[PDB]
Amino acid sequence: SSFVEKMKKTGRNIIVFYGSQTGTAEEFANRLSKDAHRYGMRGMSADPEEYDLADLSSLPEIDNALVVFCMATYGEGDPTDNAQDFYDWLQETDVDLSGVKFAVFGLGNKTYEHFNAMGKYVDKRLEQLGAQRIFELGLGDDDGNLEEDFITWREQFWLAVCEHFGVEATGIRQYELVVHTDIDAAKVYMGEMGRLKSYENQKPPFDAKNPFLPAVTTNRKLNQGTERHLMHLELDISDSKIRYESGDHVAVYPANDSALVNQLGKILGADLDVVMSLNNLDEESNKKHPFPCPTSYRTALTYYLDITNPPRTNVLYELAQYASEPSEQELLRKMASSSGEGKELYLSWVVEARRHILAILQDCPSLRPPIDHLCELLPRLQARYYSIASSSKVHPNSVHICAVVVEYETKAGRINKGVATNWLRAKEPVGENGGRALVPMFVRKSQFRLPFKATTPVIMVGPGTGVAPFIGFIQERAWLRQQGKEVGETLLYYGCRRSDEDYLYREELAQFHRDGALTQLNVAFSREQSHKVYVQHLLKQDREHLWKLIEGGAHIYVCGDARNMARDVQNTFYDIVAELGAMEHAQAVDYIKKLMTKGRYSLDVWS
Ligand SMILES: Cc1cc2nc3c(=O)[nH]c(=O)nc-3n(C[C@H](O)[C@H](O)[C@H](O)COP(=O)(O)OP(=O)(O)OC[C@H]3O[C@@H](n4cnc5c(N)ncnc54)[C@H](O)[C@@H]3O)c2cc1C
Ligand SMILES: Cc1cc2nc3c(=O)[nH]c(=O)nc-3n(C[C@H](O)[C@H](O)[C@H](O)COP(=O)(O)O)c2cc1C
């Protein structure tokens, strides 16, 4: 099916494709799509996977055609899975795109190696093919505030649109509510993703759309201290046909705090147990419902919607119309402004204060919107990825997780709890008579991998939870040694605050070093002396040996905090290569960056 014909038969001149893995780019495209209306135009948003972009050459057949791309970048500057077909096409095609008018807004994070590689490539590639750029590439940075980057871009975009096409700003619910009163409890979604009763009746293959319900066999606290809670879980995937390797990620679909959900109901004065359905008013769309329907409000707010994350500007704007108090409405209304005091208050009152929806309704009492509209505005609750801490060579039937619970106090005087980590923390291991706890998950393949050759040495840097994939790495290297194969050096550079507060897998690691599996265990305690001692410090001290391994062909792996750690560790490695390779700093940078392309300097960082 040609998206161009689709556009002709539905009267649309604007099409916004989205490359998204966790919904953000998708939401951004939907917002741009709805925006067309204010300019006498008609837009639609679309998943490029459900189409064939070769059809872009046929875009000129629509008067005033305009295509916009909202694209997120993932692993190693690669495209999202739903944009992979698009990517591959752009790399092999040489079609003349003269007459095609486009604009690209890339979603990225500058703490990653290839910043907005996807957006940059699409934008650069369409021009090469002859397309005409209607407005500059947008560089959204989720390390700063993607939302602000977006509204800033959006504003300038439409102005360019008005200018080039000669249109003007002439100066709405997407769904409609249907309360299912006579429904059979059996036809109601209870939190499953995908087909109805998929949880109750499990059948492979399990993926993001059909998550497996494993049994939590273990859930134990890893840290000795008590300042934080670091836990180690083991999920039994027996009978799932699911495969994985150390380095892969497990994604989980969490549930919101029952208490938080109950408070939202109460403050909105709404029976959360009412079953209902929200139907897309756009008869032509694929997205019939914002989430599985019919379903009760409670279920929606617990399994399908994001109620903890600080709301984006469009959500605060719509809500404004439900605040009777004058000063309270003024406050919410301005929060959507491009800049000025409106932008300042947003960043301050919403973002920095980290106010979730309930905190907003509490700190703006006059706000009393209907629960069904909110359900339409809120983002879908996303799964959380964790680096499997087990090797499929040793635990083929189990998936291990190592995580730190997220809990902190806000400026707003409240106590925020991380969705997936507090949820995971409360999962009770299977009991002699226990109750299977539901931990909806699926595996996500990655490029993070042990060397093809067991003889190849490995340098692993993972402070804090970043130690996660390495537990599996060391598990496998031991297994290999037990298999009688020759195994090169296996060094781990771990780090934490204090040896009595949060040293993870202390016993397991020490035993591995005694068995000979873990060649070297080097740990940096950042808080046992006035000055901070980090992993990069230990790396420098060992500059001599590391350079030898590096020059010999060893593989480097960095996992954990991307914001600072990754940056410091890479800088030290530049240092090591420059000083001992005798080359210039900029040559060392070239050098290290080339190891990445050879797959010998792998990264698994997050924030
Ligand atoms: C590829 C990848 C691999 C990962 N691997 C692991 C892993 O193996 N182990 C692990 O523990 N995590 C890992 N994560 C992180 C994990 O996916 C979750 O982000 C993390 O567990 C928190 O999720 P949550 O739902 O509990 O918290 P959420 O409800 O999602 O809250 C997270 C947000 O809370 C805010 N926040 C946290 N602390 C503060 C603070 N003190 N002050 C202000 N704001 C704060 C930040 O905005 C943070 O993004 C990984 C992430 C990625 C992307
Ligand atoms: C596993 C993972 C890998 C990422 N890799 C990159 C990357 O290489 N470059 C970049 O600029 N941003 C990277 N990001 C950040 C995302 O591009 C950014 O968070 C984007 O807003 C996500 O959009 P989505 O919700 O539409 O998928 C990564 C995020 C995750 C979670």
Side-chain angles (χ1 to χ4, degrees), residues 4 185 227 322 422 569 577:
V4 165
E227 292 191 49
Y322 297 107
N422 272 260
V569 171
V577 177

Short mmCIF file of all heavy atoms in Angstrom, two decimals, residues 4 185 227 322 422 569 577:
data_model
loop_
_atom_site.label_atom_id
_atom_site.label_comp_id
_atom_site.label_asym_id
_atom_site.label_seq_id
_atom_site.Cartn_x
_atom_site.Cartn_y
_atom_site.Cartn_z
N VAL A 4 1.40 7.40 -0.51
CA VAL A 4 0.99 8.54 -1.30
C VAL A 4 -0.49 8.39 -1.66
O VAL A 4 -1.26 9.33 -1.48
CB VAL A 4 1.86 8.69 -2.58
CG1 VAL A 4 1.19 9.65 -3.57
CG2 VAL A 4 3.22 9.25 -2.20
N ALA A 185 -16.40 -9.86 32.04
CA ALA A 185 -15.07 -9.68 32.58
C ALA A 185 -14.04 -10.43 31.73
O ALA A 185 -12.86 -10.06 31.70
CB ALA A 185 -15.02 -10.19 34.02
N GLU A 227 21.80 2.69 52.40
CA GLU A 227 21.50 3.98 51.79
C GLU A 227 20.62 3.78 50.55
O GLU A 227 19.67 4.53 50.30
CB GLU A 227 22.80 4.68 51.37
CG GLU A 227 23.67 5.12 52.53
CD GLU A 227 24.80 6.04 52.10
OE1 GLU A 227 24.52 7.02 51.37
OE2 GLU A 227 25.97 5.79 52.50
N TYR A 322 -8.96 23.03 32.27
CA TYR A 322 -9.68 22.40 33.37
C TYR A 322 -9.30 22.99 34.73
O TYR A 322 -9.60 22.41 35.78
CB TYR A 322 -9.43 20.89 33.38
CG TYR A 322 -9.93 20.15 32.16
CD1 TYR A 322 -9.03 19.66 31.20
CD2 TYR A 322 -11.29 19.95 31.94
CE1 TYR A 322 -9.48 18.99 30.05
CE2 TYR A 322 -11.76 19.28 30.80
CZ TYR A 322 -10.85 18.80 29.86
OH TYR A 322 -11.29 18.14 28.73
N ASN A 422 11.06 -0.08 41.68
CA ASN A 422 10.28 -0.35 42.89
C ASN A 422 9.36 -1.54 42.65
O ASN A 422 9.07 -2.32 43.57
CB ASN A 422 9.47 0.87 43.32
CG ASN A 422 10.27 1.78 44.24
OD1 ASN A 422 10.11 1.74 45.47
ND2 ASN A 422 11.16 2.58 43.66
N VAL A 569 36.40 7.59 31.12
CA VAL A 569 37.08 6.34 30.78
C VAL A 569 37.62 6.38 29.35
O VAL A 569 38.72 5.92 29.08
CB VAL A 569 36.13 5.14 30.98
CG1 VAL A 569 36.76 3.86 30.42
CG2 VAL A 569 35.85 4.94 32.48
N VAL A 577 46.73 5.40 25.03
CA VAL A 577 47.20 5.19 23.67
C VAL A 577 48.18 6.26 23.21
O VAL A 577 49.17 5.94 22.55
CB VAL A 577 46.02 5.12 22.67
CG1 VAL A 577 46.56 4.97 21.24
CG2 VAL A 577 45.12 3.95 23.04
#
